[PDB]
Amino acid sequence: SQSNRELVVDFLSYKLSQKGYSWSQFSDVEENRTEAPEETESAVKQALREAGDEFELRYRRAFQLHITPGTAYQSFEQVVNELFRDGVNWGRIVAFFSFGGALCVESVDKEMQVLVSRIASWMATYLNDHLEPWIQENGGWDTFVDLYG
């Protein structure tokens, strides 16, 4: 079974690293970074990293939140709730990852880096509670790799 924690940690590690930050500075949860490239989990991680890059590029071409530690949970959950309210698809799942990554990077920039591990928690919880039934019914993360990898 695919760990959603592992995908969150990998994706947020990637987005932080693109801005010069290291995940390990903000959490003691480690990622499995030694698994073979041929493994399905490595393929999922790579597909999600690249899909996030492509999402962020397209978002920037087409398109205030004022995150604070006291409002971050509600702002995260309300955006994610509206994102998925009329349905789930893999592109909206990529958007969910990119949104979390953006919040994390911004949190470190604004001296609110305690939020990095908390955003990661909220993302994994949302995946495990609310996205996992759809993921399982739509061919799992292997199907994501077929479509995006």
């Binding site: 899909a51 492509e54 999402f55 397209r58 978002y59 087409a62 398109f63 205030q64 939140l65 702002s75 309300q78 955006v79 994610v80 709730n81 509206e82 994102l83 698809n89 893999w90 592109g91 909206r92 799942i93 990529v94 958007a95 969910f96 990119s98 949104f99 739509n138 199907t143 479509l147 995006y148």
Partner: peptide, 25 residues
Amino acid sequence: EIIHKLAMQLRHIGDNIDHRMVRED
């Protein structure tokens, strides 16, 4: 209004990169 606006922009781009799964019906 910013939460709705942001969610709909994320959703629009999400749908734009998506619609990749094959419908078998």
